């Protein structure tokens, strides 16, 4: 009887351990995802400012060209349950944030290509003046 109960004491301590490892990993994932979200914020912002500046450059260039054991199992399960519920929250959380950032990256990237093209256009026009 006793050997098995020791075996499950081992199983549940190790379970609580690696669950905590999942927990800490998931939070620091979310931390850097916020960090990188805000980084993509400024990427968008400079793209916006450059869009305005390329409008100005377009017009200027155009004008230029013109010009005991049971209890411990129970407690370990308690705490594993707590962590597991909370980790579920963390998984749903990461999925949502990745989704939002994915649309943001797509828009950022299209804007970058457009700005790049406009800059080659203006540079080529300026070369002929």
């Amino acid at each position: 009887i006793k050997f098995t109960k020791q075996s499950s004491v081992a199983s549940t301590r190790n379970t609580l351990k690696m669950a905590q490892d999942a927990e800490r990993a998931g939070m620091n994932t979310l931390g850097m995802l916020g960090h990188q979200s805000e980084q993509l914020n400024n990427v968008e912002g400079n793209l916006d400012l450059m869009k305005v500046q390329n409008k100005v450059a377009d017009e200027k260039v155009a004008e230029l060209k013109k010009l005991e054991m049971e209890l411990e199992i129970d407690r370990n399960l308690d705490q594993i349950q707590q962590v597991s519920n909370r980790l579920k929250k963390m998984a749903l959380t990461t999925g949502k944030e990745l989704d939002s950032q994915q649309k943001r990256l797509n828009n950022i990237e299209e804007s970058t290509d457009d700005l790049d093209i406009n800059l080659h256009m203006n540079t080529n026009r300026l070369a002929g003046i």
Partner: protein, 60 residues
Amino acid sequence: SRTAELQAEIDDTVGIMRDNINKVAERGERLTSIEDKADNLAVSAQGFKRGANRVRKAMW
């Protein structure tokens, strides 16, 4: 019944995390593409700056 519920929760969270692995892989793809295009944008910006300055010196 508690252990089974905990298991169901863990399996669901595994599913969500596998989805996340797929999403972060797509994100890493996208970020590599964006870094390439941002390098392109930077180079084009230096080029446009220099061309405009040369147009000034040609005119003046």
